[PDB]
Design an enzyme around this catalytic site. Structure first.
Site, short mmCIF file in Angstrom:
data_model
loop_
_atom_site.label_atom_id
_atom_site.label_comp_id
_atom_site.label_asym_id
_atom_site.label_seq_id
_atom_site.Cartn_x
_atom_site.Cartn_y
_atom_site.Cartn_z
N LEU A 48 -8.20 17.37 6.32
CA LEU A 48 -8.81 16.05 6.50
C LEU A 48 -9.35 15.87 7.92
O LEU A 48 -10.40 15.24 8.11
CB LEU A 48 -7.79 14.96 6.16
CG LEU A 48 -8.24 13.50 6.33
CD1 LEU A 48 -9.36 13.13 5.35
CD2 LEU A 48 -7.06 12.57 6.17
N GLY A 58 -0.93 -12.49 5.93
CA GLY A 58 -0.55 -12.76 7.30
C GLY A 58 0.17 -11.59 7.94
O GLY A 58 -0.01 -11.32 9.13
N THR A 59 1.00 -10.90 7.16
CA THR A 59 1.68 -9.70 7.66
C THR A 59 0.72 -8.52 7.71
O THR A 59 0.58 -7.87 8.76
CB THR A 59 2.89 -9.39 6.77
OG1 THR A 59 3.82 -10.48 6.82
CG2 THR A 59 3.59 -8.10 7.20
N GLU A 113 -10.82 17.96 9.65
CA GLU A 113 -12.12 18.61 9.73
C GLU A 113 -13.22 17.73 9.14
O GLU A 113 -14.32 17.65 9.69
CB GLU A 113 -12.07 19.97 9.04
CG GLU A 113 -13.17 20.89 9.47
CD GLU A 113 -12.99 22.28 8.93
OE1 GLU A 113 -12.02 22.96 9.33
OE2 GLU A 113 -13.82 22.70 8.09
N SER A 132 -3.04 -4.99 3.82
CA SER A 132 -4.14 -5.85 3.42
C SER A 132 -4.82 -6.44 4.65
O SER A 132 -4.22 -6.57 5.72
CB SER A 132 -3.67 -6.98 2.50
OG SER A 132 -2.87 -7.93 3.20
N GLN A 162 3.33 -2.23 -2.02
CA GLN A 162 3.12 -1.93 -3.43
C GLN A 162 2.19 -0.74 -3.62
O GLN A 162 2.41 0.08 -4.52
CB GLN A 162 2.60 -3.18 -4.15
CG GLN A 162 3.63 -4.32 -4.10
CD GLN A 162 3.31 -5.48 -5.02
OE1 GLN A 162 4.21 -6.15 -5.51
NE2 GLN A 162 2.02 -5.73 -5.24
N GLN A 186 2.95 -7.03 1.51
CA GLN A 186 3.05 -6.83 0.07
C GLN A 186 2.07 -5.76 -0.42
O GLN A 186 2.46 -4.82 -1.12
CB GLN A 186 2.84 -8.14 -0.67
CG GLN A 186 2.72 -7.94 -2.19
CD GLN A 186 2.48 -9.23 -2.95
OE1 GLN A 186 3.22 -10.20 -2.81
NE2 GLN A 186 1.43 -9.25 -3.76
N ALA A 187 0.79 -5.89 -0.05
CA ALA A 187 -0.20 -4.91 -0.50
C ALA A 187 0.16 -3.51 -0.03
O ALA A 187 0.12 -2.55 -0.81
CB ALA A 187 -1.59 -5.30 0.01
N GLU A 200 -8.23 -15.96 4.21
CA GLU A 200 -8.32 -14.51 4.27
C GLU A 200 -9.52 -14.00 5.07
O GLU A 200 -9.36 -12.99 5.78
CB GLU A 200 -8.30 -13.92 2.85
CG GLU A 200 -6.91 -14.04 2.20
CD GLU A 200 -6.72 -13.19 0.95
OE1 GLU A 200 -6.00 -13.63 0.03
OE2 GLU A 200 -7.28 -12.08 0.89
N1 LIG Z 1 -4.84 -3.76 -4.21
C1 LIG Z 1 -3.80 -4.56 -3.97
N2 LIG Z 1 -3.98 -5.73 -3.27
C2 LIG Z 1 -2.93 -6.55 -3.02
C3 LIG Z 1 -1.66 -6.22 -3.47
N3 LIG Z 1 -0.81 -7.22 -3.09
C4 LIG Z 1 -1.52 -8.14 -2.39
N4 LIG Z 1 -2.84 -7.75 -2.37
C5 LIG Z 1 -3.97 -8.42 -1.71
O1 LIG Z 1 -3.57 -8.66 -0.37
C6 LIG Z 1 -4.03 -9.92 0.07
C7 LIG Z 1 -2.82 -10.81 0.39
O2 LIG Z 1 -2.02 -10.14 1.35
P1 LIG Z 1 -0.50 -9.70 1.11
O3 LIG Z 1 -0.27 -8.23 1.34
O4 LIG Z 1 -0.03 -10.11 -0.27
O5 LIG Z 1 0.28 -10.63 2.18
P2 LIG Z 1 1.37 -10.07 3.22
O6 LIG Z 1 0.91 -8.80 3.89
O7 LIG Z 1 2.69 -9.86 2.52
O8 LIG Z 1 1.42 -11.25 4.31
P3 LIG Z 1 2.25 -12.63 4.13
O9 LIG Z 1 2.85 -12.74 2.75
O10 LIG Z 1 1.30 -13.75 4.46
O11 LIG Z 1 3.35 -12.58 5.17
C8 LIG Z 1 -4.85 -10.51 -1.06
O12 LIG Z 1 -6.19 -10.15 -0.84
C9 LIG Z 1 -4.33 -9.78 -2.28
O13 LIG Z 1 -5.35 -9.67 -3.24
C10 LIG Z 1 -1.47 -5.05 -4.18
O14 LIG Z 1 -0.35 -4.73 -4.59
N5 LIG Z 1 -2.55 -4.22 -4.43
MG LIG Z 2 3.92 -11.30 1.81
#
Ligand SMILES: Nc1nc2c(ncn2[C@@H]2O[C@H](COP(=O)(O)OP(=O)(O)OP(=O)(O)O)[C@@H](O)[C@H]2O)c(=O)[nH]1
Ligand SMILES: [Mg+2]
Ligand SMILES: CC(=O)O[C@H]1C(=O)[C@@]2(C)[C@H]([C@H](OC(=O)c3ccccc3)[C@]3(O)C[C@H](O)C(C)=C1C3(C)C)[C@]1(OC(C)=O)CO[C@@H]1C[C@@H]2O
Ligand SMILES: Nc1nc2c(ncn2[C@@H]2O[C@H](COP(=O)(O)OP(=O)(O)O)[C@@H](O)[C@H]2O)c(=O)[nH]1
Ligand SMILES: [Ca+2]
Ligand SMILES: [Mg+2]
Lengths: 67, 424, 440
Positions: free
Chosen positions: C252, C144-145, C254, C140, C15, C11-12, C183
């Site tokens: 970069l 987990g991913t 360099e 992130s 996004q 997700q992180a 985490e």
């Molecule tokens: N800066 C930022 N941090 C994010 C974002 N989305 C999730 N996080 C952070 O990422 C961590 C959670 O991991 P995620 O990326 O949401 O989880 P995932 O990679 O999808 O893994 P799973 O859902 O467990 O399969 C937490 O610390 C969140 O605060 C984002 O869009 N921006």
């Molecule tokens: Mg996720």
């Protein structure tokens, strides 16, 4: 000097190929060990559940002996 | 889609199960005929977690109704939203269980369990990606207690990598007259410790006290108690049913709430509660002992993990400040070797009739007070061997009672071990 | 030539990838449908922006990117969103069941079911490159991913692409927006597993970004959208040298030469300025001296730590916009005489400067003011190890009781993996102590 030049680049190739080789074996070992561990945990879970079925057989059989 | 399969067993299980489906159907804009007539796309975004969709744009609860007698389920089919359930998902026997855990678990329940498993199998096969199961039942009776835990074990055999969640109603002499309830409860807890991933402890002792002392109800009815249960179940499932980031599925909730596999018994809570409101007041209330659906004082133990869900239009900055406020000022009651063990979710959609609400899910070591109360009532009868013939008559042995008691006693000492543990 | 492939995991990563690719499109003049009227070479080219965008014969400029997540709901928003035409559907890869905040599920149980498909899709992007330079991996630490699948992917990438460079943008967890108690576990596990496979990693402390948004942009409760738009500006500054060219541009790679003295010491500390609202920027233009000064304010760091309590091994200044060397040198001289900048004794003390003349941009509806000039400082300071220390301490508190460890063992992991990972972090902290000690 030409022979040293050959040895440097062959050493670079050798170290890169060994890096890939080590990473490949380490990953295959981890995946196999993980697969075995998770299956063993599931098997222990089902074996306990099957042991409960066995106990439920004895209870129903033990009631039929009472009657 | 991440589907949940819902099962309700026995009288209590089907009663609170029917109310749960009534309450969340209203939240999701679904009428008793199964049609959607709501006004927010948030209602339908994750509707498939709990509802199948048939042609005609009809939504059918993914629910299975189980009992050893047809009485309660006939009332469910006849009551409100009775036509929304799938008719083939009604599975009932005739003999009944007679408040006998052994009859539910080994005798009449075992005769009916395979026909229930056929329905569970059918609903699960039609799932895009099954999450797991939620069961509603009481521990004090016979069909919800013995056959409920039997269903859990049999389902876990066929779905061993799925999450098993229960809403388990704990017996109380204040509510139920039946004498053998400490037996049925202790035998059931023996099963829940081994075969479920998360259990909400819905304590009839707490529900009565809330209705009597807080709601000023002289003679609480089951309808009154079940109103607290349905409001609670709505709150604790909000993160599963609406878009959200925190605890949005059963497994993530379990990973956040269960640090040791046996300690998966949650103390639910709800605010506001008043007889027939600011974020600080909402936060203070949800952490009050008076608002717990389990008859335990959290100030008599320590929190391992906590989930908090706020519902309605409110300032998220204020929620964040107040949740930090509560933890900092009560730091003694949160174990320090689990950092950041309180997680907070916010859903824009409030429950029916409330402008805002808060729901509390605590994994506290003070839950031992609940199990100590049941063990106390259990051992008072088991030393005299009172009423044991009801159970040995079905084929059981005194050893099974002894093992159940010691397992529950072990669970209590394990809560105490982690309550006493320190970081240094 | 010199193509760069971006990979956004979980997700992180996804996004932030949304935010970055939107910003890139704005910087280069690429429309949401992929068209770029200023690009006169149809179907290909060798321009600087072609390092990050391929081109179709229909004139579409397509990100050299793969998005991967183990559940579909985040990437589904990409598939139906504003920039859905930018990507080929095969670039967006989803499973059905996520890793449930469990490293073990991302690396093993769930991740192993999709890893081969992901590598096949990366191979398809690599096959279109005439001179692939490396990968940028966004993820992130806490998910987990992001933790488990990234490590698996990084291991597999070392096998399939050898020593080809892999850089990370890694989201370091903060309690204000954290979603899982475990985490710290996932962070230490993925840092241990990825350490030997990463050439350079830019950690982004969510708490630092959160604080900057609240303080500098007056956002009361920042959302992921708030954080990601700020994060994308820092990412854009770092990658700008690859996407634009100019006389004063410095690649970069360099900066990388200066930033990484030993293979394991590869975590630069980024600082970015100016972060200012439109309401505050309207009055005053911020000079080269002012934004440079802000780089040495710890409040503007992407990772919370105190460089004043560590030693520098490199200092790089990446300017963009209306900036000339004369003003940079004057600003640097002022800072050198009035700031606590202590280098290790085995490293020269000059600052390395690059300037990209293309001015920064902002996304419509955003919080950041559009400014004439900006700067990202990249330093190698031993103080960044404080971020490891904070994670390692939370790890130790929970692991001493084996709290939550059964979730990982249940998915096939062993306690030996936790201790091996934690020992590697201890050695890493020891490495950061050793490199700062004076020579003899
Ligand atoms: N800066 C930022 N941090 C994010 C974002 N989305 C999730 N996080 C952070 O990422 C961590 C959670 O991991 P995620 O990326 O949401 O989880 P995932 O990679 O999808 O893994 P799973 O859902 O467990 O399969 C937490 O610390 C969140 O605060 C984002 O869009 N921006
Ligand atoms: Mg996720
Ligand atoms: C429209 C309105 O404000 O009326 C509200 C209320 O006032 C309000 C008293 C609720 C009422 O609930 C019982 O009095 C009750 C709760 C459990 C068992 C027996 C009785 C209410 O009856 C239910 C309904 O759920 C709403 C929401 C309102 C009515 C019908 C009275 C209440 O329950 C819930 C679940 O919230 C009890 O504490 C909260 C505070 C509430 O504020
Ligand atoms: N809260 C609540 N408790 C109930 C309800 N119905 C029964 N109980 C409790 O459940 C226990 C009896 O179990 P019951 O479900 O009736 O037996 P079963 O049908 O064989 O499973 C007693 O402790 C009752 O107090 C209900 O509708 N709400
Ligand atoms: Ca071109
Ligand atoms: Mg009854």
């Amino acid at each position: 000097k030409r022979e040293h030049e050959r040895e440097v680049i062959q050493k670079a190739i050798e170290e890169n190929n060994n890096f890939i080789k080590m990473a490949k074996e380490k990953l295959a070992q981890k995946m196999e060990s993980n697969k075995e561990n998770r299956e063993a945990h599931l098997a222990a879970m089902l074996e306990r559940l099957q042991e409960k079925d066995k106990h439920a057989e004895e209870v129903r059989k033990n009631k039929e002996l009472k009657e | 889609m991440r589907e949940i399969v819902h099962i309700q067993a026995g009288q209590c299980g089907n009663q609170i199960g029917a109310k749960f489906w009534e309450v969340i159907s209203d939240e999701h804009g679904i009428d008793p005929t199964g049609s959607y007539h709501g006004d927010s796309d948030l209602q339908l975004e994750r509707i498939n977690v709990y509802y199948n969709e048939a042609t005609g744009n009809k939504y059918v609860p993914r629910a299975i109704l189980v009992d050893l007698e047809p009485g309660t389920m006939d009332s469910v089919r006849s009551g409100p939203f009775g036509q929304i359930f799938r008719p083939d998902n009604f599975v009932f026997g005739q003999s009944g269980a007679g408040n006998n855990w052994a009859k539910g678990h080994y005798t009449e329940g075992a005769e009916l369990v395979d026909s229930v498993l056929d329905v569970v199998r059918k609903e699960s096969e039609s799932c895009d990606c099954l999450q797991g199961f939620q069961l509603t039942h009481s521990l004090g009776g016979g069909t919800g207690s013995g056959m409920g835990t039997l269903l859990i074990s049999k389902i876990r055999e066929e779905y061993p990598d799925r999450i098993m969640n229960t809403f388990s109603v704990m017996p109380s002499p204040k509510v139920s007259d039946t004498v053998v309830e400490p037996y049925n409860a202790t035998l059931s807890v023996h099963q829940l410790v081994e075969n479920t991933d998360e259990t909400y402890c819905i304590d009839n002792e707490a529900l009565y006290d809330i209705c009597f002392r807080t709601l000023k109800l002289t003679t609480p009815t089951y309808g009154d108690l079940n109103h607290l249960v349905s409001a609670t179940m709505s709150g604790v499932t909000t993160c599963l049913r609406f878009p959200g980031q925190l605890n949005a599925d059963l497994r993530k909730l379990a990973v956040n709430m269960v640090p040791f596999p046996r300690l998966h018994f949650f103390m639910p809570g709800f605010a506001p509660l008043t007889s027939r409101l600011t974020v600080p007041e909402l936060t203070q209330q949800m952490f009050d002992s008076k608002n717990m659906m389990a008859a335990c004082d959290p100030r008599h133990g320590r929190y391992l993990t906590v989930a908090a869900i706020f519902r309605g239009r409110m300032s998220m900055k204020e929620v964040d400040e107040q949740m930090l406020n509560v933890q900092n000022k009560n730091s003694s009651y949160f174990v320090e070797w689990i950092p950041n063990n309180v997680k907070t979710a916010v859903c824009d959609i409030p429950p029916r009739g409330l402008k805002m609400s808060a729901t509390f899910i605590g994994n506290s070591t003070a839950i031992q007070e609940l199990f100590k109360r049941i063990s106390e009532q259990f051992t008072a009868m088991f030393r005299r061997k009172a009423f044991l013939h009801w159970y040995t008559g079905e084929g059981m042995d005194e050893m099974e009672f002894t093992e159940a008691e010691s397992n529950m006693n072990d669970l209590v000492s394990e809560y105490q071990q982690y309550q006493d543990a320190t970081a240094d | 030539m010199r193509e760069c492939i971006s990979i956004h995991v979980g997700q992180a990563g996804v996004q932030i990838g949304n935010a970055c690719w939107e910003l890139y499109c704005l910087e280069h003049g690429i429309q949401p449908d992929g068209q770029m009227p200023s690009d006169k070479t149809i179907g290909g080219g060798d321009d600087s922006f072609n390092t990050f965008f391929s081109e179709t014969g229909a004139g579409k400029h397509v990100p050299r990117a793969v998005f991967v997540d183990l559940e579909p709901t985040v990437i589904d928003e990409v598939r139906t969103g504003t920039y859905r035409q930018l990507f080929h559907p095969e670039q967006l890869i989803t499973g059905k069941e996520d890793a449930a905040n469990n490293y073990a599920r991302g690396h093993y149980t769930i991740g192993k079911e999709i890893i081969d498909l992901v590598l096949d899709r990366i191979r398809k992007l690599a096959d279109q490159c005439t001179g692939l330079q490396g990968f940028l991996v966004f993820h992130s630490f806490g998910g987990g991913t992001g933790s488990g699948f990234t490590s698996l992917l990084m291991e597999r990438l070392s096998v399939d692409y050898g020593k080809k460079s892999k850089l990370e943008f890694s989201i370091y967890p903060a309690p204000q927006v954290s979603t899982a108690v475990v985490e710290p576990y996932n962070s230490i596990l993925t840092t241990h597993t990825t350490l030997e496979h990463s050439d350079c990693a830019f950690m982004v402390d969510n708490e630092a970004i959160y604080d900057i948004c609240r303080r500098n942009l007056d956002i009361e409760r920042p959302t992921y959208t708030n954080l990601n738009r700020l994060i994308s500006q820092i990412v854009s500054s770092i990658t700008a040298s690859l996407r634009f060219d100019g006389a004063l541009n410095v690649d970069l790679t360099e900066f990388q030469t200066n930033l990484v003295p030993y293979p394991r010491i590869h975590f630069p500390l980024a600082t970015y300025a100016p972060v200012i609202s439109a309401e505050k920027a309207y009055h005053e233009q911020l000079s080269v001296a002012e934004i440079t000064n802000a780089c040495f304010e710890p409040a503007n760091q992407m990772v919370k730590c105190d460089p004043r309590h560590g030693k520098y091994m490199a200092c790089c200044l990446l300017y963009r916009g209306d900036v000339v060397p004369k003003d940079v040198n004057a600003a640097i001289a002022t800072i050198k005489t009035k700031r606590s900048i202590q280098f290790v004794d085995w490293c020269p003390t000059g600052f390395k400067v690059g300037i990209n003349y293309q001015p920064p941009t902002v996304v419509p509806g955003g919080d950041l003011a559009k400014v004439q000039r900006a700067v990202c400082m990249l330093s190698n300071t031993t103080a960044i190890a404080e971020a490891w220390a904070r994670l390692d301490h939370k790890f130790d508190l929970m692991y001493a009781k084996r709290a939550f460890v059964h979730w990982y063992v249940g998915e096939g992991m062993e306690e030996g993996e936790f201790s091996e990972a934690r020992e590697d972090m201890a050695a890493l902290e020891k490495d950061y102590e050793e490199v700062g000690v004076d020579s003899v």
